[PDB]
Write a protein that binds this ligand. Sequence first.
Ligand SMILES: CC(C)(C)NC(=O)CN1Cc2ccc(-c3nc(NC4CCOCC4)ncc3Cl)cc2C1=O
Length: 346
Amino acid sequence: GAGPEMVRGQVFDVGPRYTNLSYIGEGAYGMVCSAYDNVNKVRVAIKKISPFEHQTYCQRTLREIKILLRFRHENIIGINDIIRAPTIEQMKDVYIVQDLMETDLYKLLKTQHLSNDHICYFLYQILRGLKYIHSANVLHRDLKPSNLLLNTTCDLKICDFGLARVADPDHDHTGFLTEYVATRWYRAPEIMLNSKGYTKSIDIWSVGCILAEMLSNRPIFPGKHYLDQLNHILGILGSPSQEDLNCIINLKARNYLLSLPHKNKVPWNRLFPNADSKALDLLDKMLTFNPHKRIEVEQALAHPYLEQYYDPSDEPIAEAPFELDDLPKEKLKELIFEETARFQPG
Ligand SMILES: CC(C)(C)NC(=O)CN1Cc2ccc(-c3nc(NC4CCOCC4)ncc3Cl)cc2C1=O
């Protein structure tokens, strides 16, 4: 009949709707399996989340749920179902059910050469999903190949909104070498200099890094630690201009930059000799040092590289735009309980 299913020694308590579980992967979040959904008659992805012991896992879980339930977009992963206990007291885990995807861009880049047509289509889809996210006044803040899911026909969906925030440009400024959470190789230079990552330009940088990694299958700026990341960026872009340096008012950040020997820009076409010239023009604009001069999502969609796809009437925006979750474990358990209530029998 039915009972608590096991996979790799752990309870994967999803039944009876979801049967024939196969293990996929693990991490800090929890465990993921595929499973046959008996109602829609599709295999699905299911992730077990066990956040209730810590405020930060609670915060990230609640963000993801609230954002993904509000969003509806072809290039953004949805939530199909959420499984949890009927009472707050009995709820130890939450299972989030999502469309099963064949692969992700991280796995694909490790194993597959991309044609220029694939690169163009993937970049189109990324920006189309991002136009929607940014139009809801949300920042993803951890865009990277492993958070771009792909199916067998190369439809792309953005996932993992655990680090997302509402945009807050008027409170973006900070001091030099301020710690940051999102993935190192996809961090904009200004994160290490004077930015909290509360503007939309943080996401465009990450997309720029992803475009570069699609062109060569290798990360463009593979820093090994916090300030080495800025070493790598400056190694390609070269020394910032006086104008760009003048926009950094903070003296520790400005004087660090002034202390460096002069570095020449590495031309994109030498770094990417096989790339489409239009792709390199768009890359240059995404990987612009000064975040105020950096291209915006809607401009990027309108770039000649994407002309075969660009269609603003088919690149929708959110009907309903949107942190403030520095709350205890116990009240965040309750909001997750309330946010998941719609999926219960009743
Ligand atoms: C805690 C919270 C909600 C803030 N963060 C996450 O839970 C982060 N995680 C981890 C994860 C793993 C898998 C999938 C997923 N994986 C597939 N397929 C696989 C098949 C094997 O190759 C790779 C793709 N299909 C659908 C989904 Cl949702 C999504 C997420 C995700 O968002």
